[PDB]
Design a protein around this ligand. Sequence first.
Ligand code: MOO
Length: 232
Amino acid sequence: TAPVTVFAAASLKESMDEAATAYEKATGTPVRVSYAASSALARQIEQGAPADVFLSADLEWMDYLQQHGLVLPAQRHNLLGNTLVLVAPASSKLRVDPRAPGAIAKALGENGRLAVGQTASVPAGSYAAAALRKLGQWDSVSNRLAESESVRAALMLVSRGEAPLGIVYGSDARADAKVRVVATFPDDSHDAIVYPVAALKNSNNPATAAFVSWLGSKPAKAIFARRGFSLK
Ligand code: MOO
């Protein structure tokens, strides 16, 4: 059986891995998941990578595929939500109020950088930049970013203590005890973090829609819920 090829936002690593396994247990159909920034995956799909299912960490990259005729609106829907958090290495004693003018910048110390997803394209980066701008803190850190290929690459910098602070999703923090949540960004400091899922129009896999539909079922939802995602 040809596996269902799922391209999933980096932040979906453990949950979609668990989901892939559970789906195959239930149906006998293997699921092969590729993770990267949602931007990277969407671009790869647009350029003809043979994916069956796409899950983005934001609306924009799903819109991107839709506008290119690769996703039909009927075959897309919102699945998950998240929060945006400021994290530090687990052993860090930093206390930071993201609303306080210059507090994020000061917490970077003399030469530290703020680990973020690449802000122009990586959903976690663009949510972070939106939050930082909304809170008036962007200029104080915009030359002090450690822009990373995905939210999980950002998380890894913080886990290693190579960035004293980073901006990741709540679920990322839950996924890595080597970081700690210093603060949660106000929900209204950025667009709602929403993960749309879609069957790709060009998919020939007989299980593509089945897999997407299955993500709505209790045990599939429970994976994401256990892992700290909200359910749409
Ligand atoms: O597409 Mo991500 O889960 O913001 O790196």
